[PDB]
Amino acid sequence: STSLYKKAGFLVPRGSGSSQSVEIPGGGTEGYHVLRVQENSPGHRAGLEPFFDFIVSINGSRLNKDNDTLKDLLKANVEKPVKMLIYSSKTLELREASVTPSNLWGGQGLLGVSIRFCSFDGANENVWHVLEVESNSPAALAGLRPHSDYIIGADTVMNESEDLFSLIETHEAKPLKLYVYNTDTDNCREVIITPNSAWGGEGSLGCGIGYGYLHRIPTRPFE
Amino acid sequence: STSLYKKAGFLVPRGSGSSQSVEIPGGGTEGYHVLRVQENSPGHRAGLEPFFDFIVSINGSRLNKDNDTLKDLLKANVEKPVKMLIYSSKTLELREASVTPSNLWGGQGLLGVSIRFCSFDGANENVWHVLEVESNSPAALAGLRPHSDYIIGADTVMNESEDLFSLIETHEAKPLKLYVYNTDTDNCREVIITPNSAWGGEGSLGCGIGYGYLHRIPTRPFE
Amino acid sequence: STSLYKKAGFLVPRGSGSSQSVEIPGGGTEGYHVLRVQENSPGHRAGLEPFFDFIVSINGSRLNKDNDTLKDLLKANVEKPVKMLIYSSKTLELREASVTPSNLWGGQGLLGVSIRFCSFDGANENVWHVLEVESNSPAALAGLRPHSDYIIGADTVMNESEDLFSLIETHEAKPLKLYVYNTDTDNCREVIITPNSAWGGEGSLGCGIGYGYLHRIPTRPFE
Amino acid sequence: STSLYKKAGFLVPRGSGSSQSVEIPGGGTEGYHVLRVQENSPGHRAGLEPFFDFIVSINGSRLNKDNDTLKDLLKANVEKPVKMLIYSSKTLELREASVTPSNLWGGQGLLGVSIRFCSFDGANENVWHVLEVESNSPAALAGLRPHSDYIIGADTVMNESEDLFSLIETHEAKPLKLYVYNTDTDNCREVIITPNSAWGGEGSLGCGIGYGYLHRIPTRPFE
Amino acid sequence: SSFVI
Amino acid sequence: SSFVI
Amino acid sequence: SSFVI
Amino acid sequence: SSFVI
C-alpha cells in the first residue's frame, strides 16, 4: 500500500502474550511472586528464581490466597522438607521443588525469600528498565543504577496502578519503595526513592525508562 | 566507596533541566504549543517549528491565555502580516517572526497550524518514543510506527496526567487521540488508538516505549 | 534443549533489506548518492532528499559511471530545466524531478548538492547511529552529537571496506573524515575526526554506536 | 555557531574505561581471562566470575605467559588447595581464592573452567550487545539470542584485531566461532556462526549490535 | 484540546 | 505488600 | 571522494 | 585458542 512499513519475523522470549494459563492444578491464575532470595537460604537451595518463579502450591494445597496459609504451613513444618509447586514465567512450566524451612540458616525468615501475592499472567511484560541515571538525581541517591537495574514494582494500595509512572507523581515528597531486579546479582531488592520534579534535572527521578521487548529481563537460550 | 559506579560527563541537549525561564516579556511561563504545521501554510512560511516552537505574543500582546484572543487577532488581520513572538524549547531563545494569516492558501485555518495551550517549562522531556511495534497491534492499526514516531501528548481533561501510561488504562475500549511527532516528516499528527490489553500481545498498545535522554526528539548541533 | 525463544511479527521499514526489486532503466545498481543539499538551492527546490535519493539518470542519459557526464549535461543546460530520474532508498521507487541548474544561485555548484557515486542496493542498512557522547571525547570535538547523528560513510585515501571500526584503527592518529546525517537538519555534513584510543575514555571515539533496525534513519509512515 | 549541546554528569560503571590503576604484583597487564565456569565445578565453588575475573597468579607464581605453568601447578596439587590471585574487571581489585583441583569432579578439566590468555586493561569495553535477531537469520541458527547475549570475542586461525565487523567480512562464508556472554546464565559459551550477506535480511548476521555505555555487561550496585 | 489556526 | 518468608 | 554539482 | 583447566 502507501505504508512505508512491512512485516518481518524476529526472535522473542517464550514468556510473552501467548497466554494461555496451561494449566494450574487448582485452577487459579494467582500465586506468590518470588522476589528476593537471600543467599544460603532454604529458598536458594531449592532453586527458587527471583522475579521468574511463582509459588503455586505447598504440599498439594493451592494458594489462591494472600492469607496466612503459606506462613502457617511453613511454621508447622519448621525443619522438615515441604514440597512446593512452582510456576516459571520464563519457561511457562510447572516444577516441583523440595524446600526445608528453617531457623538455623543465618538469614531472616524460614525460607529467606521475599514474596508478593499477584498474578503471573503477563508479569514478564510489566518491567521498567532503568536507563541513564543523572548524578545527584533522586534515582542515584536512592540506589538505582543505569542499565543493570529493572524496576518491577512498588508497594501499592488502595486499588490503583499496574503501571509505574502513576506512582511517581503521587509521592512528590512522600518516600516511595520500589522492587528492583539487578541483572548482575540476578536478584530483587528494595529501593527507597524520593520523587522530586524540582530536583534540577530530567523528570522526577532523574533517570530514563525503557519498556517492552527491548527492555525485558534477559532470558537464557535454553530450558 | 563500595559503589561500583562513578561519574562521567556526557553531551546533552541545551533543552534540559537548567530551567530557567529567561525571560518572557509579559512574565508568564505558558503559551501556545506549535504542533502540526501544514505545508504551504502561513505558519510554514514564518518558519514555525512543530513541537519546538511556542507562540508567546502577537503584535506585542502576551498570551497568558487559552482564550479566543489569538483567534480574534488573526481574524482581524486576516490578510495582513502580524508579528509573533516565538519561544523555542530547542534554543531556549525568543525570536520575532512575521506571519500573514490567510484564507487564500490551499489548506485549513488562517495559519495552518495546530496548537495547544500549555507550559513550555520542561516540555522537551515529556516525550514518549515509540520503539518496536508488533504486527496487528493497536499501535500498528492506529498508524504508530517504530522508532520514527514520538508520542508527545493526548486530549486530556478533567485535571489528570502529564504522563502517558495513565491514559492507556482509562481508554480500555474508549478510543484515544495521540499527538505524534515523526522525525522524518519533522511534524506532528493525530493518531487514533484503541487500547486493548487483551489484543493478544505485548502491553495494551503492542509497542515499546522509551523515555529520557536516549529517547528525545533529535536536535541539530548548532543554533 | 528447548528454546526459550519463539517468533513474532514486527513492523520494519520497506527498505529492509530493500529486498529485492531493482527495476532500473539502464540496468545498473549504481548511481549518484545525494548527500548534502544546500538551502534555497536548485536541488532543494527540486525536492532532492539527502541520503535517501539517488540520481540514476539525467535527461534520459544513464549514470552508470563515475565520470563528468552529469556535471557536463547540467553545464550545457545552465539556466534551463533538466529532467532527472531519481531512486529513493526510502520508497524503493523511481520518480522524475525537474531541476534548473544556475550560475546565479550563487552558492557552490549548479545545483548546490553534494554527491557520491555508489550503489543503492541495501544502503539503508549501512548506517551507524551515534549514541552517547563523552565530554572532551574525539567525537565531541569533531562535532558528532548524541542520538541525532548517524554516520553513513567516509572518505578513504587508502582503501578499505569503509566499515567504521575497520577505519578507526587504521586512523589511530591520522584524522578521518566522516559523512554524518542529522535527523533534525535532515541533511548530511562532513565530520573530520581524530581517533585516539589513548584519550581519557571509552574506545577511540568516546561515543556509543548502534546498528540495525533499532538504529536506522527514521522514515515517515506514508509514501 | 552556538552549540545546542552542553555537559551533564551521569553514572558509569567503575571499570570505565577502567581508568587507570594496574597495581599488579609481577608487573604485567595480562593474565588468564575466565570464560566459561562449569556448574558444581571447583572453579564455581571458588567463586570465579565468567568474563569479569582474570587469573593473574597461582601459589605466588605470576602468569605473564601463555604456557603450561598454570595447568602443571594444578596438576601437581591435584587434590589439594591452591591459592589463586584474581583480578576483577568489575571491581578493578585483587583477591585471593582457594581452589581445589580434582580428577573426581569428573567433568572436563581439573577446575572446569574455560580460559584464554589476554590483557584485562579495558576489557569491559570490548563487548558487543546483540540487539534484535531476525528469524532464520545466521545469528538465530547459530544460537545467538536478542538482548540477553553479549559477544565478547572470537577464535581466529588467521590474524586480525578480533574486531567483530572486521571478521564478519573475512568469514563471508567460512564459519566463525564467537565467545558469547548471557546475562541470565552469567556464563560464557561458544557460538559457531556462518556470516552470509546474501541471506534474506539485514547485514550478514541478521541481528542488531549495540556498543558502549548503553550496551555493557551489567554490574551490581556494590562491591 | 488541540485546535487548528 | 511484600514480606519475607 | 564527494563533489558538489 | 581457549582451553579448559
Author numbering:
A (entry chain A), B (entry chain A), C (entry chain B), D (entry chain B): -14 to 208
E (entry chain C), F (entry chain C), G (entry chain D), H (entry chain D): 306 to 310
How do the authors describe this structure?
Therefore, we co-crystallized GRASP55 PDZ domains with peptides corresponding to the C-terminal 19-mer of mouse JAM-B (JAM-B_P19) and JAM-C (JAM-C_P19). The bound structures of GRASP55 with an uncleaved 6xHis-Tag crystallized in the I4122 space group and contained 2 molecules in the asymmetric unit. Notably, GRASP55/JAM-C and GRASP55/JAM-B structures exhibited an unexpected ‘closed’ conformation that was characterized by a 33 degree rotation angle of PDZ2 towards the PDZ1 domain and a 12.1 Å root mean square deviation (rmsd) after superimposition of PDZ1 domains to the previously reported structure of the ‘ligand-free’ GRASP55 PDZ domains. The overlay of our structures with the published ‘ligand free’ form of GRASP55 reveals that the conformational changes occur in the main chain of the second PDZ domain (PDZ2) and its relative orientation to PDZ1, which compacts the PDZ2 into a ‘closed/cargo-bound’ conformation. The cargo bound conformation may be preferentially selected in the presence of C-terminal JAM peptides. These structures indicate that JAM-B_P19 and JAM-C_P19 bind to a groove on the PDZ1 surface, and C-terminal residues penetrate the conventional hydrophobic cavity found in this PDZ domain. Most of the observed interactions occurred via the last four residues of JAM-B_P19 or JAM-C_P19, where the carboxylate group of Ile0 is coordinated by a network of hydrogen bonds to the main chain amide groups in the “carboxylate binding loop” of GRASP55 PDZ1. Residues at positions 0 and -2 are inserted in an extended conformation and present supplementary hydrogen bonds with the 5th β-strand, which adds a 6th antiparallel β-strand to the conventional structure of the interface. Several supplementary intramolecular hydrogen bonds involving the Arg101 residue from the PDZ1 and Ala139 from the PDZ2 of GRASP55 were identified and contributed to the conformational exchange between free and bound conformations. Measurement of the relative binding of GRASP55 to JAM family members using homogenous time-resolved fluorescence (HTRF) or isothermal titration calorimetry (ITC) revealed five- to seven-fold higher affinity interactions of GRASP55 with JAM-B and JAM-C (4.9 μM and 3.7 μM, respectively) as compared to JAM-A (27 μM).
GRASP55 is a medial/trans Golgi molecule that is involved in Golgi stacking, Golgi fragmentation during mitosis and the unconventional protein transport triggered by cellular stress. The cargo receptor function of GRASP55 was attributed to the interaction of GRASP55 PDZ domains with motifs in the C-terminal part of cargos such as CD8, TGF-α, or CD83. Members of the Junctional Adhesion Molecular family exhibit a similar structure with two extracellular immunoglobulin domains, a single transmembrane region and a C-terminal PSD-95/Discs Large/ZO-1 (PDZ)-binding motif. We demonstrated that GRASP55 interacted with the PDZ-binding motif of JAM-C in testis.
